[PDB]
Design a protein around this ligand. Structure first.
Ligand SMILES: O=C(O)CCCC(=O)Nc1ccc(C(=O)O)c(C(=O)O)c1
Length: 438
């Protein structure tokens, strides 16, 4: 396959549904490269667990943890790492209120080259145990010879775009990684980077980040087809922010408008949102504790009941993962019969203004609160007009894209409710015999 899109291993499914999956120990294995230094960008860390995932021969190599924690949370993380002299920390600045360092990325420097991993999992045991999570694995990027002058750039501009994303941190530990990336040849990269960084972006910079970055890439590198109005947008996520009092405030006005862009020329497009129901969580492999990683609050949800008529159940028979609750986030543009897709995005970004950006100042400024990162698969980057949807995720041309959940998405039934993580569920027990009492 050209796509190098993987799911994490799920404990409890039959082997055929893990044969093409990756555990974190597989990613860090010596078979992927001889490690000399790594950077782990994430939100939540279990440092003791994390070090144990590296091969024993690599456990003393330098590790940089890039996080967004402040105050007591920051002190707790430092305390976790202090036993390991090889671990350094970089606190990503979050100068806008209510922002998060959400990006999940590994930079893996080897004797043999460099690898970039952009994924969706926190660095804790539960996130790699029984969840549906997504991974993009870069090629092994070779080092550019000393004294050789070449760009090392891909047709998707991934090298410059990754350096630009890291430059936004203004961090000395990450300038070191920028210098590493400069010395490597990333020309084989066929995905586009879509990042979010905190700030207020106008004019020259509005297209750099968030949903305007997505819009720019779709305008420049996708084409509009006849009956494009009939091609749905699908969004799939593990959390929801405050979107406003009605759909015109952000969801269907600027977010959907960016996602329905195709091509350069100047809405009835259906919008599917996939988010686990209470029943999805109750009957999942983890049971109700899966909902600890689906942090949709009642305070937020009760202000936007209009949103839930867009919600569709989690179903993933294609990958054997209907009972592995999703912490992956994906967005895509299927054809009206869901047999093809115009593009596919895997990302850390949930359905929230903090992650994707919200327009300010009479539409002239895009304000983003958080760090996010994802990769965009466009047919033009593979010499294609569209991707065929792979019928079974782990089955056998290779030009079919492995969509990890079922299409078409199934609307909530009249008795279904979205998972809300801070109210109790005491009517029916989960797969472990328990109720949920927050
Ligand atoms: O959107 C907003 O305005 C706030 C909504 C609250 C929220 O969703 N918090 C959250 C934090 C960390 C992670 C993670 O890194 O796993 C996740 C997740 O991805 O589920 C979610």
């Amino acid at each position: 396959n050209p796509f190098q899109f993987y799911l994490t291993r799920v404990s409890g499914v039959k082997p055929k549904y893990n044969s093409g999956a990756l555990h974190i120990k597989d990613i860090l294995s010596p078979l992927f490269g001889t490690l000399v230094s790594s950077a782990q960008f994430n939100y939540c860390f279990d440092v003791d667990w994390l070090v144990k995932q590296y091969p024993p021969e690599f456990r003393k190599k330098p590790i940089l943890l890039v996080h967004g924690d402040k105050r007591e949370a920051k002190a707790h993380l430092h305390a976790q790492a202090k036993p390991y002299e090889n671990i350094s920390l970089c606190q990503a600045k979050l100068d806008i209120a209510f922002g998060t360092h959400h990006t999940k990325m590994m930079l893996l420097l080897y004797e043999e080259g460099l690898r970039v991993v952009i994924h969706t999992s926190n660095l804790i045991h539960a996130d790699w145990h029984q969840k549906t999570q997504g991974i993009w694995l870069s090629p092994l990027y070779p080092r550019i010879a000393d004294g050789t002058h070449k760009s090392g750039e891909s047709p998707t501009h991934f090298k410059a775009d990754l350096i630009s994303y890291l430059m936004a941190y203004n961090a000395p530990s990450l300038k070191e990684w920028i210098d590493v990336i400069h010395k490597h040849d990333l020309s084989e990269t066929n995905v586009y980077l879509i990042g979010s960084t905190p700030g207020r972006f106008q004019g020259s910079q509005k297209d750099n980040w968030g949903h305007f970055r997505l819009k720019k890439l779709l305008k420049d590198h996708a084409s509009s087809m006849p009956n494009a109005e009939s091609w749905p947008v699908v969004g799939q996520f593990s959390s929801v922010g405050s979107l406003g009092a009605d759909e015109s405030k952000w969801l269907c006005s600027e977010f959907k408008e960016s996602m329905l862009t195709l091509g350069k020329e100047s809405s009835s497009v259906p919008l599917y949102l996939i988010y686990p129901s209470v029943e999805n969580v109750r009957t999942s492999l983890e049971g109700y504790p899966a909902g600890g990683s689906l942090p949709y609050s009642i305070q937020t949800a009760e202000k936007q009941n209009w949103l839930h008529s867009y919600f569709h159940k989690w179903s993933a028979e294609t990958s054997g993962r209907s009972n592995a609750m999703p912490h992956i986030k994906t967005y895509m543009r299927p054809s009206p019969d869901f047999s093809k897709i115009a593009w596919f995005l895997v990302t850390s970004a949930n359905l929230s203004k903090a992650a994707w950006g919200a327009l300010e100042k009479n539409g002239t400024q895009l304000m983003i609160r958080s760090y996010e990162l994802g990769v965009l698969f466009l047919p033009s980057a593979f010499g294609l007009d569209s991707f065929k949807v792979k019928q079974k995720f782990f089955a056998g041309p290779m030009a079919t894209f492995p969509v990890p959940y079922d299409l078409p998405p199934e609307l909530y039934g009249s008795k279904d409710r979205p998972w809300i993580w801070n109210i109790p569920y005491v009517k029916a027990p989960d797969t472990h015999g328990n109720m949920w009492v927050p």
